[PDB]
């Protein structure tokens, strides 16, 4: 049957009738071959065996790859779902299940390697860091191949005992939808091998018929052992040939190991492999029709590389070949699939000029304008070898030149792009628009979606095509008949209109009428809709979805303006399947949600009105740019043209080469996302800054300012007088930033004042006010004050260094990171797992950690998802070497004739170096002295001088600190951090516990409680949560801490200064309340406070200093809940879902009476 | 070196002496408490061997046995290894314990403490092994580690009662 699927749908599809077991782990891109394969056995879909395949979640790929040995060695087909980073980890077992002969197969969505920086996105970089393990390994171009090769991976497999790796594209396949011709598991069963699975049973362990494996050998018999298995490396290809030929007799779509396209007397031809090979064949019939003999050698069966099936589709009259491959290996004389080529032909004597590139990676846009940059190099008189293409490579010249722009799309494909906001329904509207057209014509479909870095309010870019004939189209549109903008913010923010078609469509979501569009509208984008005569069209979506009532969801609305001027069906048929769609969607709704969607249908057609414009705006002109404010250069050069969408224009020359960036640039970026702002009352106000505690993106902060720098205030910077003995004689004002402010309504929440002293005004009223507010608030000048960062009001008064980043709204991780750097934030170094933190913490080109006044702020890095708390160790261990130089040095100044007030300060700090007051206290007095001493010195004695001042980084104390999410520490990097717990290092652990993998959509994590339903626990998590603070405390000498800030800000900063004081490891484990629980953002403080007074999350301390001191190290902060427990699980969503469902929530509240019951006999 | 090294014990990679204690495992895989855990050793009790054993293969659920293997690398006469391994439990330096989850569904304690009261003197048996006469500081490292063991009954005691 035809559906719309994507790639990674596609692999499940065969993955799933095709294995009994799938130990996976998730990772983006493969994460949703995962998630599908537990929905699917959620709901009891039957394999080829006619059972439901067994899901198993492992604690890392490292673990998930053991599990898949296991299972192989005893007996079950067993495949697993990777990319990227998981790949490396699976490369230890790879080697045992192929030097085994194991049938298996894992499916990979093909994802760059983190080298100089992490990338989600697409290349073969992880595959080919595996190519030498053994496995085989089969490359699919297209959805549709997915499907195929996905089936010829497994059959295979079983035949030739070699496991297999089935690889695509990240992203660029993985999660492209098209509709292709999906295979029945009945139509696979009867092409399977059954004598063949047979045998792998008998091989199994079984005490009835033992057998021993895995032996450890010695050198008389290894080598011998290890070249036993040459037979059936050397029958693999032609078992997966013919594996080929029974699936092209099923679909009549043909294989081979390698396959060509193009002129049979070809004498330029490309080799490639996965998804470049599409838009190369395509290149490939735009350039043979035009009289150019070119042809393209798609590479299927990568490993083992068969020399014939190679040479047997080679054509005699290739004079010139070009390899591209879709990786890097640096230093390396040419990449993996060119030095094979180059190596066969060698080894057949073909004299063949070969020329090897780079293209695509991270997927990096490769389209066909590319692929004849690649033809015309092997035109040229002497080709360039170890090329790239797709970048401006300024410094090493590997570039190719992008002369001109050509058009390979074939005669009659519709190209649509829709920009869109953060999860307003664009993206969802056009797959179902995708799923309508092809389910209901013969027209090919296909959907591309573009995602960004910020969590909310981003730009979406969907690129859309249908067609007569298959779409081979695998980049970004280039020539769009329409493009849609669901948001007029982007109106002068981002190139709509850009390579849109003469007469094209131009369909905007506006209040604007067609005599504002003069007004409104800019001169370039006025020009292009004039001279290319555009059919421009405009809608009130929001107005109609206001009157109808349904709020602003504008997704219905926007996808009938679609098909209404689309023509691409008849507009009566598109009605009746959206409107048909909507049942689907919203039937269970009930019948009032229902006939609103309705309505929204029947409205959105008699509201869209075409502009009909005049002629003259062809000749507008730009306004005069305004006087543009001196930047950083690296602002200038990097940061704004990577967010006005333009980054891939930058060329090498731009970028460090080791992908370090500066500190404090996201308060440049000035999103203004939000719908509203609070407003601050100042009769309201008792000044008590825990609006400034719990901002996820310190969008609000206290002022204080003596009375003379509020001379050039706007009027309505109004201030009132400071509260307390500390401020005495000063004014007082809690400010916002109205541009950086994200409308979550945390802080309207938090505010406990008699009557609310923060109101909630819509963005737009009072931003032109506010911004003058906050310009003036930010340029206030230092003010020394006394108040005691220990509480939560002096705490505030401290500059936050963590600022404005991409988290969501009402994130309740970053609230947690913020308030670290308000009281240790001068002095700390930071080791980041992957994860959220990670991603709002660390994405290109935007740092949200920022510096103070001296310059001084915290260094941040992140290395990997595993090894967090080694890295931090390892840092610990540097910092330690760093300061024992700086000792020395010192140590010999006071042997130095130098000054009696320089040896004062010197014995002071050799004193205290291991204090963080005192170090900072006599820290700063050598440095006062420092200039003047190095004057007064000469020789030798000035040269000791020199080092001690090379060295001042070090005089004042670092505190390390570990931060990452409750998937690192519970599961894949809980391994390292009970190590490094268990060293004793003065580290401080921080753990945001989400209770799910958040970053990559919820997953389910050992964090996740009983009953909970997360990503790969469709019907819930049996096994209760483990708790990571009991098998810390195990140690004695570790400090663990249970926190929410939600739930009591006091106990939060107890915990947190005993953690950093305390002169050893430290583990801070906090409550971080997330959009993965199903929940209302704007409450999330208040989730947190009934989580605690529930009984689901406790709170306490455990301080091995008060065992020294004779006392009870455990202390439980809060004894005994007042809310229900089974209320507190209503209220979110991830519970809720569940309702077998009634036995989970009992077990759940049985387990948080025994956890509550045994820290109240450890407190006794 | 590893983290089941004791307390002063020498090894490679530990020149000087392990300052940290041994890892406690099986107060970790307690903590979930449907997982079986049992610490045996031969040379101690036979019976309590035996009883740990055919427990933890019947348990419908996770087992964890952690078993005092005596070694060459200890330092010590392989005649008596059976009784190197009694001499370590009589001393207090290896505790005998289970921890059965089915217990604790018939509303009974799950942890049982398989022997209460050592009678063997701790530095005695720390003298009898060359992987701890090889460190002879080191008394200030015997005594931290006479002092962690103490700690460790006297948890079990807490458990137990
Ligand atoms: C070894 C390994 N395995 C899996 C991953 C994928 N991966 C991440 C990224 C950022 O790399 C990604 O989304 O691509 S983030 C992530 C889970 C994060 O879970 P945590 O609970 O630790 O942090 P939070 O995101 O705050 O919930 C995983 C599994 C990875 N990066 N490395
Ligand atoms: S509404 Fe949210 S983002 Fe805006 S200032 Fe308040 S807490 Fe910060
Ligand atoms: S929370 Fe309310 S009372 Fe407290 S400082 Fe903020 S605005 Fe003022
Ligand atoms: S932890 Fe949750 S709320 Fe915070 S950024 Fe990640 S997904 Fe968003
Ligand atoms: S006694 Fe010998 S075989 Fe036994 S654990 Fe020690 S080294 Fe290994
Ligand atoms: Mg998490």
């Given at each position: 049957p035809k559906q719309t699927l994507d790639g990674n749908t596609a692999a499940a599809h065969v993955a799933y009738a095709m294995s009994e077991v799938a130990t996976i782990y998730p990772i983006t891109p493969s994460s949703p071959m995962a998630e599908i394969a537990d929905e699917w056995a959620a709901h009891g879909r039957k394999n080829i065996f006619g059972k439901t395949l067994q899901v198993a979640e492992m604690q890392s790929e490292a673990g998930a790859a053991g599990a898949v040995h296991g299972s192989l060695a005893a007996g079950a087909l067993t495949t697993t779902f990777t990319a990227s980073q998981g790949l490396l980890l699976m490369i230890p077992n790879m080697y045992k299940i192929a030097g085994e002969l194991l049938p298996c197969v894992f499916h990979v969505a093909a994802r760059a390697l983190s080298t100089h920086a992490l990338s989600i996105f697409g290349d073969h970089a992880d595959v080919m860091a595996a190519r030498q393990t053994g496995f085989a390994m089969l490359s699919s171009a297209s959805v549709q191949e997915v499907m195929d090769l996905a089936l010829v991976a497994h059959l295979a497999t079983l035949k030739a005992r070699v496991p297999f790796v089935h690889f695509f594209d990240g992203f660029r396949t993985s999660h492209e939808v098209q509709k292709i011709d999906v295979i029945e598991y009945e139509d696979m069963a009867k092409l399977v091998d059954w004598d063949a699975?047979?045998?792998?049973?008998?091989?199994?362990?079984?005490?009835?018929?033992?057998?021993?494996?895995?032996?450890?050998?010695?050198?008389?018999?290894?080598?011998?052992?290890?070249?036993?298995?040459?037979?059936?490396?050397?029958?693999?290809?032609?078992?997966?040939?013919?594996?080929?030929?029974?699936?092209?007799?099923?679909?009549?779509?043909?294989?081979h190991l390698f396959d060509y396209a193009g002129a049979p007397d070809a004498e330029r031809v490309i080799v490639s492999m996965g998804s470049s090979c599409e838009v190369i064949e395509e290149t490939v019939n735009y350039l043979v029709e035009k009289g150019e003999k070119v042809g393209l050698i798609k590479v299927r069966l990568f490993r083992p590389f068969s020399a014939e099936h190679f040479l047997k589709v080679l054509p005699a009259s290739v004079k010139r070949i070009a390899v591209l491959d879709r990786t890097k290996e640096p230093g390396s004389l040419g990449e993996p699939l060119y030095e094979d080529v180059q190596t066969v032909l060698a080894e057949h004597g073909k004299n063949i000029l070969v020329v090897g590139g780079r293209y695509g990676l991270g997927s990096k846009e490769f389209n066909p304008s590319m692929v004849k940059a690649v033809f015309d190099n092997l035109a040229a008189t002497t080709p360039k070898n170890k090329f790239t293409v797709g970048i401006t490579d300024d410094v090493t010249h590997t570039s190719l030149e992008i002369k001109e722009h050509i058009d390979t799309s074939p005669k009659g494909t519709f190209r649509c792009k829709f920009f869109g906001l953060g999860?307003?329904?664009?993206?969802?509207?056009?797959?179902?628009?995708?799923?309508?057209?092809?389910?209901?014509?013969?027209?090919?479909?296909?959907?591309?979606?573009?995602?960004?870095?910020?969590?909310?309010?981003?730009?979406?870019?969907?690129?859309?095509?249908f067609g007569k004939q298959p779409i081979q189209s695998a980049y970004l549109i280039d020539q769009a008949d329409l493009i849609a903008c669901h948001n007029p913010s982007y109106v002068g923010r981002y190139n709509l209109l850009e390579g849109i078609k003469p007469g094209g469509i131009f369909l905007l979501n506006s209040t604007w009428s067609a005599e504002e569009m003069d007004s409104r509208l800019p001169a370039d984008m006025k020009r292009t809709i004039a001279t290319k005569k555009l059919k421009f069209y405009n809608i009130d979506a929001v107005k109609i979805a206001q009157e109808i009532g349904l709020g602003s969801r504008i997704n219905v609305i926007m996808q009938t303006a679609f098909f209404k001027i689309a023509n691409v069906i008849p507009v009566d048929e598109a009605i009746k399947y959206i409107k048909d769609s909507i049942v689907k969607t919203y039937g269970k709704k009930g019948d009032k949600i229902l006939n609103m969607n309705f309505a929204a249908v029947d409205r959105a057609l008699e509201a869209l009105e075409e502009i009909k414009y005049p002629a003259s705006w062809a000749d507008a002109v730009d306004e005069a740019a305004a006087t543009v404010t001196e930047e950083p250069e690296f602002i200038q050069k990097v940061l704004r043209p990577i967010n006005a969408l333009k980054g891939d224009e930058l060329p090498v020359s731009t970028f460090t080469p080791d992908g370090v960036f500066p500190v404090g640039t996201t308060k440049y970026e000035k999103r203004g996302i939000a719908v509203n702002i609070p407003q601050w009352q100042p009769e309201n106000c008792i000044q008590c800054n825990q609006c400034s505690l719990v901002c996820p993106h310190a969008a609000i902060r206290p002022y204080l300012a003596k009375p003379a720098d509020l001379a050039g205030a706007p009027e309505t910077f109004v201030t009132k007088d400071a509260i307390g003995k500390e401020a005495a004689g000063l004014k007082f004002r809690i400010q916002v930033s109205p541009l950086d402010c994200t409308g979550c309504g945390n802080c309207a929440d938090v505010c406990p004042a008699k009557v609310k002293a923060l109101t909630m005004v819509p963005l737009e009223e009072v931003t032109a006010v506010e911004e003058a507010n906050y310009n003036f608030a930010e340029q206030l000048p230092e003010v020394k004050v006394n108040f005691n960062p220990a509480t939560v009001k002096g705490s505030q008064f401290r500059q936050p260094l963590l600022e404005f980043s991409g988290a969501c709204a009402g994130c309740g991780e970053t609230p947690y990171v913020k308030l670290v750097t308000q009281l240790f934030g001068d002095r700390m170094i930071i080791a980041n797992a992957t994860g959220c933190s990670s991603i709002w913490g660390g994405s290109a080109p935007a740092c949200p950690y920022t510096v103070n006044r001296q310059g001084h702020g915290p260094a941040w890095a992140s290395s990997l998802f595993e090894d967090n708390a080694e890295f931090g160790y390892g840092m610990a261990l540097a910092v330690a070497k760093r300061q024992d130089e700086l000792a020395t040095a010192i140590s010999k100044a006071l042997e130095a004739p130098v000054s009696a007030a320089f040896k004062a300060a010197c014995e002071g700090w050799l004193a205290g170096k291991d204090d963080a007051d005192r170090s900072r206290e006599y820290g700063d007095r050598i440095k006062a002295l420092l200039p003047g001493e190095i004057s007064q010195a000469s020789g030798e004695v000035k040269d000791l001088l020199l080092d001690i001042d090379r060295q001042k980084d070090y005089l004042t104390k670092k505190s390390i600190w570990i931060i990452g999410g409750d998937g690192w520490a519970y599961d894949i990097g809980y391994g390292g951090l009970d190590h490094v717990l268990a060293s004793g290092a003065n580290v401080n652990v921080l753990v945001l516990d989400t209770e799910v993998y958040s970053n990559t959509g919820g997953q389910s994590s050992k964090a996740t409680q009983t009953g909970a339903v997360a990503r790969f626990a469709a019907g819930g998590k049996f096994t209760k949560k483990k708790d990571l603070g009991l098998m810390a405390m195990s140690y004695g000498y570790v400090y663990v801490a249970s926190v929410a800030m939600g739930a009591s800000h006091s106990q939060l900063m107890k915990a947190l200064i005993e953690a950093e004081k305390y002169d050893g490891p430290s583990l801070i484990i906090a409550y971080a309340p997330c959009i993965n629980h199903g929940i209302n953002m704007t409450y999330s403080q208040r989730e947190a406070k009934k989580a605690v007074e529930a009984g689901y999350w406790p709170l306490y301390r455990y301080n091995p200093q008060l065992a020294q001191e004779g006392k009870n190290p455990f202390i439980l902060d809060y004894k005994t809940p007042t809310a229900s427990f089974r209320d507190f699980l209503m209220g979110e969503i991830?519970?809720?879902?569940?309702?077998?469902?009634?036995?989970?929530?009992?077990?759940?509240?049985?387990?948080?009476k025994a956890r509550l019951e045994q820290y109240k006999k450890l407190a006794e």
């Amino acid at each position: 049957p035809k559906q719309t699927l994507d790639g990674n749908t596609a692999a499940a599809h065969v993955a799933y009738a095709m294995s009994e077991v799938a130990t996976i782990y998730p990772i983006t891109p493969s994460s949703p071959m995962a998630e599908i394969a537990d929905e699917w056995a959620a709901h009891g879909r039957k394999n080829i065996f006619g059972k439901t395949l067994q899901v198993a979640e492992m604690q890392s790929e490292a673990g998930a790859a053991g599990a898949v040995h296991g299972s192989l060695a005893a007996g079950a087909l067993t495949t697993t779902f990777t990319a990227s980073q998981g790949l490396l980890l699976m490369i230890p077992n790879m080697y045992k299940i192929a030097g085994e002969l194991l049938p298996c197969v894992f499916h990979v969505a093909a994802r760059a390697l983190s080298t100089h920086a992490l990338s989600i996105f697409g290349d073969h970089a992880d595959v080919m860091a595996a190519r030498q393990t053994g496995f085989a390994m089969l490359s699919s171009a297209s959805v549709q191949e997915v499907m195929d090769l996905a089936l010829v991976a497994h059959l295979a497999t079983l035949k030739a005992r070699v496991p297999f790796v089935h690889f695509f594209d990240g992203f660029r396949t993985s999660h492209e939808v098209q509709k292709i011709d999906v295979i029945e598991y009945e139509d696979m069963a009867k092409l399977v091998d059954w004598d063949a699975i047979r045998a792998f049973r008998q091989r199994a362990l079984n005490p009835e018929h033992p057998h021993q494996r895995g032996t450890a050998q010695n050198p008389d018999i290894y080598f011998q052992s290890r070249e036993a298995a040459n037979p059936y490396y050397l029958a693999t290809p032609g078992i997966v040939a013919q594996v080929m030929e029974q699936v092209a007799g099923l679909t009549g779509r043909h294989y081979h190991l390698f396959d060509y396209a193009g002129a049979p007397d070809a004498e330029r031809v490309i080799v490639s492999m996965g998804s470049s090979c599409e838009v190369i064949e395509e290149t490939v019939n735009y350039l043979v029709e035009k009289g150019e003999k070119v042809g393209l050698i798609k590479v299927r069966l990568f490993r083992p590389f068969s020399a014939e099936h190679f040479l047997k589709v080679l054509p005699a009259s290739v004079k010139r070949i070009a390899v591209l491959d879709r990786t890097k290996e640096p230093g390396s004389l040419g990449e993996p699939l060119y030095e094979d080529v180059q190596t066969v032909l060698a080894e057949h004597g073909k004299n063949i000029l070969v020329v090897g590139g780079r293209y695509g990676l991270g997927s990096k846009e490769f389209n066909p304008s590319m692929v004849k940059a690649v033809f015309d190099n092997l035109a040229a008189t002497t080709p360039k070898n170890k090329f790239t293409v797709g970048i401006t490579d300024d410094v090493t010249h590997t570039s190719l030149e992008i002369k001109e722009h050509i058009d390979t799309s074939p005669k009659g494909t519709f190209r649509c792009k829709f920009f869109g906001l953060g999860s307003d329904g664009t993206v969802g509207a056009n797959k179902n628009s995708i799923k309508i057209i092809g389910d209901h014509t013969d027209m090919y479909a296909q959907g591309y979606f573009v995602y960004d870095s910020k969590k909310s309010g981003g730009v979406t870019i969907s690129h859309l095509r249908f067609g007569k004939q298959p779409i081979q189209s695998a980049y970004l549109i280039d020539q769009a008949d329409l493009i849609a903008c669901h948001n007029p913010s982007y109106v002068g923010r981002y190139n709509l209109l850009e390579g849109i078609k003469p007469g094209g469509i131009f369909l905007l979501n506006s209040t604007w009428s067609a005599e504002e569009m003069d007004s409104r509208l800019p001169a370039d984008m006025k020009r292009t809709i004039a001279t290319k005569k555009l059919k421009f069209y405009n809608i009130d979506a929001v107005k109609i979805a206001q009157e109808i009532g349904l709020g602003s969801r504008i997704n219905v609305i926007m996808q009938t303006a679609f098909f209404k001027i689309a023509n691409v069906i008849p507009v009566d048929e598109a009605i009746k399947y959206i409107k048909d769609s909507i049942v689907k969607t919203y039937g269970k709704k009930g019948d009032k949600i229902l006939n609103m969607n309705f309505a929204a249908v029947d409205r959105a057609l008699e509201a869209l009105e075409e502009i009909k414009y005049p002629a003259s705006w062809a000749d507008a002109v730009d306004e005069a740019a305004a006087t543009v404010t001196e930047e950083p250069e690296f602002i200038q050069k990097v940061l704004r043209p990577i967010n006005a969408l333009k980054g891939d224009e930058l060329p090498v020359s731009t970028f460090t080469p080791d992908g370090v960036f500066p500190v404090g640039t996201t308060k440049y970026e000035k999103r203004g996302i939000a719908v509203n702002i609070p407003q601050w009352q100042p009769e309201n106000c008792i000044q008590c800054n825990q609006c400034s505690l719990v901002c996820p993106h310190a969008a609000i902060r206290p002022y204080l300012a003596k009375p003379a720098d509020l001379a050039g205030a706007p009027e309505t910077f109004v201030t009132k007088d400071a509260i307390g003995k500390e401020a005495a004689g000063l004014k007082f004002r809690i400010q916002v930033s109205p541009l950086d402010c994200t409308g979550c309504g945390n802080c309207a929440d938090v505010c406990p004042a008699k009557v609310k002293a923060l109101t909630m005004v819509p963005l737009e009223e009072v931003t032109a006010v506010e911004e003058a507010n906050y310009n003036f608030a930010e340029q206030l000048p230092e003010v020394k004050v006394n108040f005691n960062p220990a509480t939560v009001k002096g705490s505030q008064f401290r500059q936050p260094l963590l600022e404005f980043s991409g988290a969501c709204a009402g994130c309740g991780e970053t609230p947690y990171v913020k308030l670290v750097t308000q009281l240790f934030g001068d002095r700390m170094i930071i080791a980041n797992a992957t994860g959220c933190s990670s991603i709002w913490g660390g994405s290109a080109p935007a740092c949200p950690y920022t510096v103070n006044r001296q310059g001084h702020g915290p260094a941040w890095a992140s290395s990997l998802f595993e090894d967090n708390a080694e890295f931090g160790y390892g840092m610990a261990l540097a910092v330690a070497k760093r300061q024992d130089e700086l000792a020395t040095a010192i140590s010999k100044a006071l042997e130095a004739p130098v000054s009696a007030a320089f040896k004062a300060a010197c014995e002071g700090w050799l004193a205290g170096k291991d204090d963080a007051d005192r170090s900072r206290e006599y820290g700063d007095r050598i440095k006062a002295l420092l200039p003047g001493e190095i004057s007064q010195a000469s020789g030798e004695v000035k040269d000791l001088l020199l080092d001690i001042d090379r060295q001042k980084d070090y005089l004042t104390k670092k505190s390390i600190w570990i931060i990452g999410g409750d998937g690192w520490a519970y599961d894949i990097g809980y391994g390292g951090l009970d190590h490094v717990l268990a060293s004793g290092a003065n580290v401080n652990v921080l753990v945001l516990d989400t209770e799910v993998y958040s970053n990559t959509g919820g997953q389910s994590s050992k964090a996740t409680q009983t009953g909970a339903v997360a990503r790969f626990a469709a019907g819930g998590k049996f096994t209760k949560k483990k708790d990571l603070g009991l098998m810390a405390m195990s140690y004695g000498y570790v400090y663990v801490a249970s926190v929410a800030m939600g739930a009591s800000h006091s106990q939060l900063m107890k915990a947190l200064i005993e953690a950093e004081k305390y002169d050893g490891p430290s583990l801070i484990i906090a409550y971080a309340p997330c959009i993965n629980h199903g929940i209302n953002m704007t409450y999330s403080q208040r989730e947190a406070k009934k989580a605690v007074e529930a009984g689901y999350w406790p709170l306490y301390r455990y301080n091995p200093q008060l065992a020294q001191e004779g006392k009870n190290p455990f202390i439980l902060d809060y004894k005994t809940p007042t809310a229900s427990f089974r209320d507190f699980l209503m209220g979110e969503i991830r519970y809720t879902s569940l309702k077998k469902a009634e036995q989970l929530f009992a077990k759940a509240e049985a387990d948080a009476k025994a956890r509550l019951e045994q820290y109240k006999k450890l407190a006794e």
